[PDB]
């Protein structure tokens, strides 16, 4: 199947409470495999999935040096952005960066990503060409100019097409029993009267990996988008995810409703009905 690696950096200032915290986590698809937290007693890169533990001390130390250096650089960056927005020293602010590479089913680079945000708003992003930037505003333009002058894009491109893909492939192979294993949802439909004349039908998907899933209700074969209550896909804590979709239907019309489930792990997409 298709796979991606992402690192997510969060740098959070907190004036009066020490230097900005920097935390990095790495994911392959929906599987976190590494973390670094500058607030840890002994900050260092720590494994968060079994298949990464086989990496050697050189690997851990390399990650750690990288994250330690980023920790310092992000603190400078927070200072810089505060200035770019004429903000006071009083407020807490956050820079986020998410970057990584997507492979297609053949393991070829599909595309790279390198996006940054400030206080939760798009700030600057590497375009799909991995060569040019999109700055959200005049502040980000300052970063863009600085990065254009330092030919940062070229660096990001080299990483995204090179190390990113190489390491992603390595992880995919090392953790193939899980990373390349799709676990289909376990499904059922529940029925709860909400009154004499309406009942809730809830379509459950449990235990599935990866998180990507489609869960829909149809009435007489028509999508019930607006009438469907669809909870956010949520982690079970055992690597798998859960989701449900609920519709309120006229009592007696239950059999006109079908739940449809699409998931990578399913031999065939599912159609379910309430089974009294």
């Amino acid at each position: 199947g298709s796979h991606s690696m992402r690192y997510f950096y969060t740098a959070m200032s907190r004036p009066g409470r020490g230097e900005p915290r920097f935390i990095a986590v790495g994911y392959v698809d929906d599987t976190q495999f590494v973390r670094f937290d500058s607030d840890a007693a002994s900050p260092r890169t720590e494994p968060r999935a079994p298949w990464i533990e086989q990496e050697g001390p050189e690997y851990w130390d390399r990650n750690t040096q990288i994250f330690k250096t980023n920790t310092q650089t992000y603190r400078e960056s927070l200072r810089n952005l505060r200035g770019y927005y004429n903000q006071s020293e009083a407020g807490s602010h956050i820079i986020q960066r998410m970057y990584g590479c997507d492979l297609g089913p053949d393991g070829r680079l599909l595309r790279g990503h390198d996006q940054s945000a400030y206080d939760g708003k798009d700030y600057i992003a590497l375009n799909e060409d991995l060569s040019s930037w999109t700055a959200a505003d005049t502040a980000a333009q300052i970063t863009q100019r600085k990065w254009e002058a330092a030919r940062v894009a070229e660096q990001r491109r080299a990483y995204l097409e090179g190390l990113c893909v190489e390491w992603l492939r390595r992880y995919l192979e090392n953790g193939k029993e899980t990373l390349q294993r799709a676990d289909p949802p376990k499904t059922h439909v529940t029925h709860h009267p909400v009154s004499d004349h309406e009942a809730t039908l809830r379509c459950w998907a449990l235990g599935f990996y990866p998180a990507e899933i489609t869960l829909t209700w149809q009435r007489d074969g028509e999508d019930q988008t607006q009438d469907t209550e669809l909870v956010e896909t949520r982690p079970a804590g055992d690597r798998t995810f859960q989701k449900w979709a609920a519709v309120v239907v006229p009592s007696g019309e239950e059999q006109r409703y079908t739940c449809h489930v699409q998931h990578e792990g399913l031999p065939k997409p599912l159609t379910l009905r309430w089974e009294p």
């Binding site: 690192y7 990095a24 790495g26 690997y59 390399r62 990650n63 040096q65 990288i66 994250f67 250096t69 980023n70 650089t73 992000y74 400078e76 960056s77 810089n80 952005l81 820079i95 970057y99 940054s116 700030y123 600057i124 970063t143 600085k146 990065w147 330092a150 940062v152 660096q155 990001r156 990483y159 190390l163 990113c164 390491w167």
Partner: peptide, 13 residues
């Protein structure tokens, strides 16, 4: 593996 520290100075925002 995360993006490696460039030869020179890691460029801040």
């Amino acid at each position: 593996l995360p993006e490696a520290l460039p030869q020179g100075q890691l460029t801040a925002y």
